[PDB]
Amino acid sequence: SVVSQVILQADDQLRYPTSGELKGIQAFLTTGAQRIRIAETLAENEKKIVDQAQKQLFKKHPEYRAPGGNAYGQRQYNQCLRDYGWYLRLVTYGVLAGNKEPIETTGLIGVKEMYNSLNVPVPGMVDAVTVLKDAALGLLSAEDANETAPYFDYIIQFMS
Amino acid sequence: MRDAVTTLIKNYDLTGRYLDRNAMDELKAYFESGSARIAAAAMINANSATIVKRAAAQLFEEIPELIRPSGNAYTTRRFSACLRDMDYYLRYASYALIAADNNVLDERVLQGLRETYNSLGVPIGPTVRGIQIMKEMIEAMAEDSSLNSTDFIASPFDHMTRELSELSV
Amino acid sequence: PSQVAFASGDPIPQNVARRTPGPSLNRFKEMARQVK
Amino acid sequence: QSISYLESQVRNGDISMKEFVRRLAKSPLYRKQFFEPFINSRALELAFRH
Amino acid sequence: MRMFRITACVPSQTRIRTQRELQNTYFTKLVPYDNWFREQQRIMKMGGKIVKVELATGRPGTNAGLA
Amino acid sequence: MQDAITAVINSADVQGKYLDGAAMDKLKSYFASGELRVRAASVISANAATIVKEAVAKSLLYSDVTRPGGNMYTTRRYAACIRDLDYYLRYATYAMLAGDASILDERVLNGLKETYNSLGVPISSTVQAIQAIKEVTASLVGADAGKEMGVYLDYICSGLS
Amino acid sequence: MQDAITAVINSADVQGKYLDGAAMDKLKSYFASGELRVRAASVISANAATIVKEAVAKSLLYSDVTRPGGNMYTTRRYAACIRDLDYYLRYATYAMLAGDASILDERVLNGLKETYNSLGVPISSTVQAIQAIKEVTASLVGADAGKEMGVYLDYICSGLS
Amino acid sequence: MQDAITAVINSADVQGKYLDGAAMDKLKSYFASGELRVRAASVISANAATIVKEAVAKSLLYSDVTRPGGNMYTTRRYAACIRDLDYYLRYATYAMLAGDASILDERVLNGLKETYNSLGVPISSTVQAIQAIKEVTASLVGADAGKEMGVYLDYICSGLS
Amino acid sequence: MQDAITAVINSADVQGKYLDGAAMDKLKSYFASGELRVRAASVISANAATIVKEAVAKSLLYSDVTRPGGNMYTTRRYAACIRDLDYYLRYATYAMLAGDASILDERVLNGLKETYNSLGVPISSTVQAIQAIKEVTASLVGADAGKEMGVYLDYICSGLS
Amino acid sequence: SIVTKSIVNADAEARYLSPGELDRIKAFVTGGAARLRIAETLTGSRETIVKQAGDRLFQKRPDIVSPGGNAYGEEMTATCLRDMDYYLRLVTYGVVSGDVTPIEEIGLVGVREMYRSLGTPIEAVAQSVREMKEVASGLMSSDDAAEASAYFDFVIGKMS
Amino acid sequence: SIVTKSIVNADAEARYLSPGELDRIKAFVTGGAARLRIAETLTGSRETIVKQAGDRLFQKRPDIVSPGGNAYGEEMTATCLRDMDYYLRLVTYGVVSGDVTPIEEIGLVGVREMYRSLGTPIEAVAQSVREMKEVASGLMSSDDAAEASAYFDFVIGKMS
Amino acid sequence: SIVTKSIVNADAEARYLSPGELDRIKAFVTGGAARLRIAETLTGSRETIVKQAGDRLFQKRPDIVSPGGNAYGEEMTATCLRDMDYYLRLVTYGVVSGDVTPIEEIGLVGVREMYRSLGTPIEAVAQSVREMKEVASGLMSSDDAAEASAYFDFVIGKMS
């Protein structure tokens, strides 16, 4: 969280948090209500979002479900959808925290070799993240979507 | 590094002056531009990798020899290094757009670019050509998007061009 | 014994191809073709 | 030129590599070769690479 | 010179991102008392856990003759 | 470290579920208390040295520890005790601002107890000094945040003991 | 030195392509500003010595700099200080006409810092004098051209920094 | 580095001879001066801070250097100037004890001019400050040891120039 | 480490009292025995290799340890044994010069017992080797100096045991 | 600058700016209007602020201005007031920049060494800055007074 | 002590003491008689020396005993005299040991931090030690006074 | 010398010399007459000392001058005598300096490697130095002989 970032910077400098850090913490505390609204809307309407994202991705990339792909088995398809759900839950956690750090420490760092070891294409998963973010933004309101979008864009950045 | 506010503050502190009306006006201009700065930074963050990939896919067609023999991106290793440099250019340009000053650009990009690239044998003309291609893509995407103010975007890339470009004339 | 004469022996000349225009001048190659 | 006193400690593991470096750099052997013959600035620059 | 015998494990935090060879994060160390404060603070900031520490060399409460 | 706001997220990640009302209530409570915590941290940062001085005067000065034969007698040992108290105050402030004692457990109580046992540091004297710090900070900040800070100070005392 | 037009032409030449729409936009912007630049330059050229007189009166006269023991004390050093202010005004006029600080880097701020250091010139005093020149020129030329000139004057001052 | 003893020893060794009467006379002179050198070193170590303080007050303070735009404006830059003076005084004492200006040459002068040229430090003004330090040290130590200290201070100044 | 004077001053400072006769007698004894200790240290420094060689020949050579399968079979292990022996001799000389066994306890017997147990070095055979070294040094430096050195040698032996 | 800090923190990890840093930047930009208001009031009142703070300090600590004190004498008192003016200017710099970095860089690095060299009581200097804080806070609303109190307290802590 | 410092240097070089170091040790051993004599003089005249030193310090700097000073009241005066006695005992210990190592490691390291914590004037403490040195030089022989003056000057410089 | 060593230590710690070093330097400076006198004794007896030491060494060790020996041959024997004179000169330097640092820096660093490359027996060189020490002690009084033998045995031990 932003509190963790500020306190870590203060500890690194061996000092108490500064005025700017304290005011940033105040701003995050003010925006916590909209953070809660983000979490509620995402968590309570994931299923439509996840279904639309998975269908759109498999339509755009008719390889994994198709021959020579990655989602032959129903178990593999369930794993792909479970990865969708886990990424969106991580996105909710990160939005609530106000910083990238929960997503970064949960499902971001090392994700490239994470899915290299599983043979899932990194461009494929980044396309999946793009479609999931598009679905969530379309399903959210304008200011709500604008607030939530940079987190998904950062995840897309880290993936590729 | 110094952003616009910090560079103005340092400039005034040099003469030992209090922030006057001109200082307040420049600060107001930057603070009003900050919304568009954040917007452009968010857009470039959203489309970053695609922007650099498209810029390379245009630059290697503008100067095809960088992928043919004796070219500087011949291997996949050289190709990935070139794309890494392009990504670095885009990221530091984004930082400079948000900071509204090119000193963060200078301290971390330009101050030894010619030395390093000459040592590695990298051309110093195609790199600025790719820089300008990235800037064109960025400004075209911004114009397509709902960005009311976009003039400032050409400043960082053009400063990179002016600094890292050989003095032809 | 004298097999070791690699640097000592006569240098093994290599062939260097003179540089020629590449795809950077495709438009001018086409111009020359049409002026043919 | 050597310091068997520190070599034995590093060998048995009493002081690991980090403390070996810390003691060796402040040892007179290094102080006569990379700090004594240099300005403080140049000595600091060399100390970074060392 | 009074010195501490410390047993600590300090797992890396950037090995995955940096792609560097692994090292045993568990180690027993003879650390000078002067450097012990900085070493312990660095260990705590690194996130590792110090499992054992003791004053290997020196007498507790000594007033003179620290060096 | 491990923030209070990050605590609910970490627990939800551990059980593989989303934040619920049973935890979002605590999240809202932390959000409400954030302003009070921020002001308390700012006040403590402004008055860091005075709190330590007052606690030392009220607890250790003119005592057996400061007198010869005590672990706080020599000038170097007194400076070490002052530095320890200052670090205690700073990390208590960090824990108060973050809303949890995880930072105190990690970056403070990692090996402090055994270090003091090896060095012969007085555990009871440390407890009394932390109590003096608690009283001084409670007086300076108010009962509302004083109790909250004393919670983490009691946590530090329990970890040391 | 490179003016705005030469800067645009150089940026195009180093890429080997012709002046596209952006180059023409920059050229026409510079041409539009050219009328104001020429007016300000001509006015400054006419009132060149008076501006230096006003700046010297505002900054250095009746000060320790001009009193005995000051670097502006001897008549030769007073004349040299006046000539230096003339240099700064003329080269600021050059940079205003060219829309660039390239001339300032090439000719003005090139070795100037250690030049003054070797000569014993007071850097802060010369900075204040250049500020007085900037303010006098702004008063004599107007808010807009005054700010335009002050851009290059502040560039020179920051170079002296 | 090299003191008088090591200097004479090296001078004899490089040409490969034993110590003759002439070298032994130099060593006798150094031994005669050793008591005065030790007394002066003790006095300077006692009054190290005061010497630099008085020199700065006598040469640099209230000049162009401390005012805005000068090279001693920021507090960090002032502390850096004080640190440079501390180096110069301490190394002058070292050279005075050793009877040889070799530690100065190999630890204070080799590249210091380049560093000041890069940083813009005014060499003339730092020479003036070192002269003030020389005057204060002479007043505090006496003519006989003051001249010896001033020899190495002037050595540092000449190396800087 | 603590020499005799440092140990006496530390004991005095533990109770925070001034130096009385009860410890000044010890100080006088140390100052009286200083010349004998210095002479013994000079002799040990002059004949350090000879003493170790003689002790090894009379205590360890032609034994099972030097035989293959013993603790001193390899040339590297023999070198390590000689290094340990002359370490013991040098640190015993240090302890004799200082008048206290703190140097031996801190820089010699820190973990020597555990290290030897882990490595397999025969502690008993090392004891006989140290006894031979003590006999040689006693018969080479003098009865009083021999006993003085043997005190620290027996202290090292007890620490090993 | 908060923008400076966020950009530097992002560059240290070599990524594009995180959504949290972007939010901090946007909040700083939004609060820039209040920042300019506070800074403008401080600079406009710089004469009265310095004068009243100097009067209060010279009443509370007559020792520094009595004979034998560092600030004793007309010139020394003027120099003390000049130092107060420098620190008020630094506080305005910090107010505009939204942080304490300019204050540290210009007038808070090696200040203890500088004032020890000059023979000044750093506690007296801190008291002077504290009185400047009180006088300035009397000249603005509750929110802006608390906002400037952050910079004033930072200077106080660095001086003591 | 000189002996322990020489032993430390020899151990750091991993060698026995050089002939020069042994000669210096022998010289210190010979001078130990005079060092003990000076220590005896100081310990015998402990009360009077501290009394005149405290009186001289009070006359020189009355602001300590004045209202608002750190040493105000009978208890504060007793604490100041106790500190005087502690530092004189440290000086005696250093003179006996032949080096300022015991003084530094007992009551000279962190002295500035301790006095900053307690609010004590470090300059006042240094002036008090200087008065102690003056009275001791007046009370003892010139050669012994000259020998102890180096240690007194070292203490006062470290407190400066 | 001791002056150089103390100054080097003070520089490394970035501090002035302590009184415990200054008094050692004073004692070293005062006790220089005896060291000088031993110097003139050795330098006056250099030729006789070298000749007698070489004669005794060759009598004790015949293989050195025997066929196949390192010193076998006219030029080889003269060069061995030259080495003996070198080490006598270095010993004189150390005696005058009151320290072994000049000897170690001049003709003691890398001596093992140098003589190993030359094929000379370092043990035989040490024996030659021992014979030189014996001759010097014979030509010197009891105290002076011991003082010079300190440096002589240092050289012998460093050689082997």
Ligand SMILES: *[C@H](C)[C@H]1/C(=C/c2[nH]c(/C=C3N=C(/C=C4\NC(=O)C(CC)=C4C)C(C)=C\3CCC(=O)O)c(CCC(=O)O)c2C)NC(=O)[C@@H]1C
């Ligand atoms: C597809 C069936 C075939 C194919 C086509 C293709 N290649 C590129 C682009 C590149 N190909 C290379 C090739 C190499 N790099 C190396 O280091 C090696 C040595 C082993 C090789 C063979 C490179 C460097 C590029 C990039 C530069 C370029 O444009 O050529 C494209 C264009 C992709 C794009 O426009 O973005 C295409 C269509 N490559 C194959 O391997 C297949 C045989």
Ligand SMILES: *[C@H](C)[C@H]1/C(=C/c2[nH]c(/C=C3N=C(/C=C4\NC(=O)C(CC)=C4C)C(C)=C\3CCC(=O)O)c(CCC(=O)O)c2C)NC(=O)[C@@H]1C
């Ligand atoms: C791509 C547009 C062009 C190109 C690129 C290329 N660069 C390298 C190697 C390096 N590039 C840099 C540059 C930077 N490092 C920095 O830190 C910064 C700012 C953040 C910059 C701009 C450096 C330092 C290197 C070497 C070190 C490294 O990469 O870590 C190569 C490699 C060449 C080779 O043969 O190895 C290449 C190919 N090449 C082209 O042809 C394009 C015009």
Ligand SMILES: *[C@H](C)[C@H]1/C(=C/c2[nH]c(/C=C3N=C(/C=C4\NC(=O)C(CC)=C4C)C(C)=C\3CCC(=O)O)c(CCC(=O)O)c2C)NC(=O)[C@@H]1C
């Ligand atoms: C000789 C009397 C006995 C003996 C010796 C022997 N020792 C080792 C190995 C080590 N000895 C030490 C001890 C010390 N190192 C130090 O620095 C000090 C304190 C200053 C001491 C006491 C250590 C640390 C080792 C480990 C290796 C090292 O080089 O440090 C060996 C060889 C062990 C091996 O496993 O190879 C030997 C043979 N052997 C005997 O039989 C004697 C009784």
Ligand SMILES: *[C@H](C)[C@H]1/C(=C/c2[nH]c(/C=C3N=C(/C=C4\NC(=O)C(CC)=C4C)C(C)=C\3CCC(=O)O)c(CCC(=O)O)c2C)NC(=O)[C@@H]1C
């Ligand atoms: C995988 C089979 C199990 C697992 C792995 C796991 N390991 C760590 C952390 C570390 N692992 C190592 C590895 C080594 N240390 C060594 O000394 C050697 C040889 C030199 C190796 C290979 C290290 C060093 C660490 C610490 C971090 C670092 O990278 O340096 C973790 C992380 C634990 C944490 O939460 O911090 C994990 C998960 N985990 C399982 O569940 C498997 C049974």
Ligand SMILES: *[C@H](C)[C@H]1/C(=C/c2[nH]c(/C=C3N=C(/C=C4\NC(=O)C(CC)=C4C)C(C)=C\3CCC(=O)O)c(CCC(=O)O)c2C)NC(=O)[C@@H]1C
């Ligand atoms: C007298 C010359 C100065 C002075 C004295 C003063 N001291 C205190 C309080 C303390 N002084 C010390 C110092 C030491 N204790 C040690 O053990 C050592 C080394 C042996 C030192 C240097 C300590 C620890 C205290 C705290 C109380 C205690 O000992 O229990 C005071 C009281 C301050 C107050 O406000 O309580 C005073 C007045 N004051 C001056 O102004 C003189 C310069």
Ligand SMILES: *[C@H](C)[C@H]1/C(=C/c2[nH]c(/C=C3N=C(/C=C4\NC(=O)C(CC)=C4C)C(C)=C\3CCC(=O)O)c(CCC(=O)O)c2C)NC(=O)[C@@H]1C
């Ligand atoms: C003061 C309230 C008590 C006290 C303190 C005291 N501490 C030391 C020495 C040390 N204390 C620490 C503690 C920490 N290091 C850390 O990183 C953390 C996190 C903030 C803590 C709490 C350490 C590491 C040391 C060692 C110092 C060093 O340089 O190695 C001393 C000195 C002990 C000595 O032998 O000199 C003292 C006196 N003493 C009391 O009586 C109080 C109850």
Ligand SMILES: *[C@H](C)[C@H]1/C(=C/c2[nH]c(/C=C3N=C(/C=C4\NC(=O)C(CC)=C4C)C(C)=C\3CCC(=O)O)c(CCC(=O)O)c2C)NC(=O)[C@@H]1C
């Ligand atoms: C009187 C006979 C004439 C006259 C004098 C006049 N001078 C000034 C101002 C200045 N005069 C000087 C001259 C010098 N300064 C030096 O150090 C030396 C060299 C040794 C000289 C010759 C200077 C530098 C000034 C500038 C002001 C200052 O001294 O700080 C004035 C005032 C000008 C004004 O308007 O400020 C006057 C009146 N005027 C006449 O008409 C007489 C012929």
Ligand SMILES: *[C@H](C)[C@H]1/C(=C/c2[nH]c(/C=C3N=C(/C=C4\NC(=O)C(CC)=C4C)C(C)=C\3CCC(=O)O)c(CCC(=O)O)c2C)NC(=O)[C@@H]1C
């Ligand atoms: C007033 C609240 C206190 C005080 C002030 C005082 N200061 C000086 C002298 C100087 N002060 C400074 C400080 C600065 N210069 C800078 O550029 C910066 C940052 C912008 C700072 C903080 C300096 C450099 C000086 C030296 C003189 C000069 O300005 O050139 C004095 C006079 C000291 C003397 O003896 O000359 C005084 C009195 N004194 C107090 O007692 C107050 C606590």
Ligand SMILES: *[C@H](C)[C@H]1/C(=C/c2[nH]c(/C=C3N=C(/C=C4\NC(=O)C(CC)=C4C)C(C)=C\3CCC(=O)O)c(CCC(=O)O)c2C)NC(=O)[C@@H]1C
């Ligand atoms: C013969 C070519 C040379 C020679 C031999 C000689 N050696 C000794 C005594 C010992 N030799 C060794 C050496 C080793 N022991 C081992 O286990 C190994 C490991 C590979 C080696 C190299 C040892 C340890 C001894 C000590 C006695 C013992 O073995 O227990 C002597 C006797 C020495 C004495 O004083 O009695 C001799 C004569 N001598 C020469 O001159 C030849 C060049």
